[PDB]
Design an enzyme around this catalytic site. Structure first.
Site, PDB file in Angstrom:
ATOM      1  N   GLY A 202      68.326  59.456  40.672  1.00  0.00           N
ATOM      2  CA  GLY A 202      68.930  60.549  40.102  1.00  0.00           C
ATOM      3  C   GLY A 202      68.301  61.972  40.130  1.00  0.00           C
ATOM      4  O   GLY A 202      67.334  61.966  40.830  1.00  0.00           O
ATOM      5  N   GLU A 203      68.451  62.466  39.219  1.00  0.00           N
ATOM      6  CA  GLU A 203      67.605  63.860  38.981  1.00  0.00           C
ATOM      7  C   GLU A 203      66.417  63.864  38.270  1.00  0.00           C
ATOM      8  O   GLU A 203      66.032  63.169  37.626  1.00  0.00           O
ATOM      9  CB  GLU A 203      68.308  65.069  38.037  1.00  0.00           C
ATOM     10  CG  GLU A 203      69.912  65.403  38.807  1.00  0.00           C
ATOM     11  CD  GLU A 203      71.011  64.712  38.440  1.00  0.00           C
ATOM     12  OE1 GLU A 203      71.099  63.308  37.857  1.00  0.00           O
ATOM     13  OE2 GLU A 203      72.187  65.203  38.113  1.00  0.00           O
ATOM     14  N   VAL A 204      65.269  64.716  38.712  1.00  0.00           N
ATOM     15  CA  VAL A 204      64.036  65.197  38.029  1.00  0.00           C
ATOM     16  C   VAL A 204      64.272  66.489  37.575  1.00  0.00           C
ATOM     17  O   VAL A 204      64.778  67.434  38.258  1.00  0.00           O
ATOM     18  CB  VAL A 204      62.929  64.960  39.119  1.00  0.00           C
ATOM     19  CG1 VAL A 204      61.654  65.256  38.402  1.00  0.00           C
ATOM     20  CG2 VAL A 204      62.918  63.490  39.654  1.00  0.00           C
TER      21      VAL A 204
ATOM     22  N   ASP B  36      56.084  54.604  50.166  1.00  0.00           N
ATOM     23  CA  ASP B  36      56.909  55.602  50.450  1.00  0.00           C
ATOM     24  C   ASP B  36      55.901  56.945  50.611  1.00  0.00           C
ATOM     25  O   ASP B  36      56.189  57.911  50.037  1.00  0.00           O
ATOM     26  CB  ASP B  36      58.130  56.107  49.592  1.00  0.00           C
ATOM     27  CG  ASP B  36      59.205  57.001  50.011  1.00  0.00           C
ATOM     28  OD1 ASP B  36      58.998  57.321  51.576  1.00  0.00           O
ATOM     29  OD2 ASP B  36      59.848  57.495  49.242  1.00  0.00           O
TER      30      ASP B  36
ATOM     31  N   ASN C  31      56.361  63.381  49.158  1.00  0.00           N
ATOM     32  CA  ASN C  31      55.942  62.639  47.865  1.00  0.00           C
ATOM     33  C   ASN C  31      54.495  62.766  47.212  1.00  0.00           C
ATOM     34  O   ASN C  31      54.318  62.276  46.215  1.00  0.00           O
ATOM     35  CB  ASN C  31      56.508  61.157  48.155  1.00  0.00           C
ATOM     36  CG  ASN C  31      57.692  60.934  48.204  1.00  0.00           C
ATOM     37  OD1 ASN C  31      58.383  61.553  47.544  1.00  0.00           O
ATOM     38  ND2 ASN C  31      57.935  59.637  48.971  1.00  0.00           N
TER      39      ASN C  31
END
Lengths: 356, 5
Positions: free
Chosen positions: A108-110, A218, A223
């Site tokens: 979801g969101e950050v 990842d 990132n």
């Protein structure tokens, strides 16, 4: 004088864990008669790993008075023995002032935010409640991992807001945003010495992670994050795993695979290791010295897999120092055992930078 | 970038 502990609101009790998920409860409840109180997802629950559901309270005019009565009298609810405290990272929701959305990931969101107490800017990772239960159960992994670490090139954990929903992981805010965007917006003015420092930072972080038996899974420019002073930090530990003996074997069901950053043995056999992160590191080097180009741009993911299996690799970016490309090439050895270590990579990059 | 596999 002192206010008695039992006279304090539930919200204030060291053994009230609010919205702590099940997995975490079982971990915290170790010995016989260990217990905590939490909220059901208006029911409160006395967990002892037996779950007893709680204007009075019983199984008193407050829940702390009930717990004290139980504890002090040893009356059966199972007998309570030791109240289990919240760990030092737990942060109340009211300590955080939430700001605007800054990204999104598979949970979801950050958001950005601020700590109310001293205005420290923070990043706040949230978990969408509509996700599958096996996924939501993994949400706190990034906190479990980062609680252990402290390094200048790794995003710092600040706290965990598990006292209520929605649950958040609070981290330092790296104000210059993601490294891919940075390369694509600022790249035309970047000196090679600066690029070398920034991938040096990444190698330093990865060397640290290897030393901790952490496999990132990842690693990519998207990132990594850049400070206002151009220091790079590794982020998004959502996929990361800790393995004492160096190999994480993929478990079970469907996986999200960033195919163009993933090593062949990881992509096809689910064998992840610091060696597979080294492959990803080579892709990061390519991103960097191409100023944010997309790798294998004319190939779909399936095509890249086939290309790489046949011995195909990314080309040398224009003006990439030759020592840097040679290092990339070593990162992309087919056999994981033939790849250099992050210790070797960091030393080489430091050597190349000092000669620049 | 990501494929479910």
């Amino acid at each position: 004088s002192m206010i008695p502990e039992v006279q304090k609101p539930l919200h204030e009790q060291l053994w009230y864990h609010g919205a702590i998920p099940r997995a975490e409860v079982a971990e915290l409840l170790v010995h016989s008669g260990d217990f905590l109180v939490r909220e059901s997802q208006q029911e409160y629950v006395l967990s002892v790993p037996r779950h007893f559901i709680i204007n009075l309270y019983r199984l008193f005019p407050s829940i702390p008075l009930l717990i004290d009565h139980l504890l002090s009298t040893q009356q059966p609810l199972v007998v309570l023995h030791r109240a289990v405290p919240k760990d030092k990272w737990v942060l109340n929701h009211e300590d955080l002032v939430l700001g605007e959305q800054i990204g999104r990931g598979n949970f979801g969101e950050v958001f950005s935010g601020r700590l109310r107490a001293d205005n420290t800017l923070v990043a706040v990772k949230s978990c969408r409640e509509t996700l599958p239960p096996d996924l939501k159960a993994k949400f706190l992994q990034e906190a479990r991992i980062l609680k252990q670490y402290s390094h200048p090139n790794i995003v710092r954990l600040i706290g965990v807001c598990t006292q209520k929903q929605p649950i958040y992981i609070v981290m330092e805010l790296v104000q210059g945003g993601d490294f891919l965007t940075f390369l694509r917006t600022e790249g035309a003015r970047l000196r090679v010495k600066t690029l070398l420092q920034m991938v040096g930072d990444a190698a330093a972080g990865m060397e640290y992670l290897e030393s901790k038996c952490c496999i990132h899974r990842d690693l990519a420019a998207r990132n990594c994050l850049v400070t206002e002073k151009n220091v790079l930090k590794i982020s998004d530990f959502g996929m990361s795993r800790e393995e004492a003996d160096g190999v994480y074997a993929a478990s079970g069901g469907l996986r999200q695979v960033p195919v163009k950053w993933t090593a062949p043995e990881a992509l096809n056999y689910g064998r992840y290791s610091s060696e597979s992160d080294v492959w990803s590191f080579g892709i990061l080097l390519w991103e960097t010295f191409s100023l944010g180009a997309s790798p294998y741009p004319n190939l779909s993911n399936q095509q890249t897999r086939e290309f790489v299996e046949k011995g195909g690799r990314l080309p040398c970016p224009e003006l990439c120092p030759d020592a840097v490309f040679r290092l990339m090439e070593q990162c992309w050895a087919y056999e994981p055992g033939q790849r250099p270590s992050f210790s070797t990579i960091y030393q080489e990059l430091q050597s190349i930078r000092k000669r620049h | 970038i990501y494929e479910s596999l």
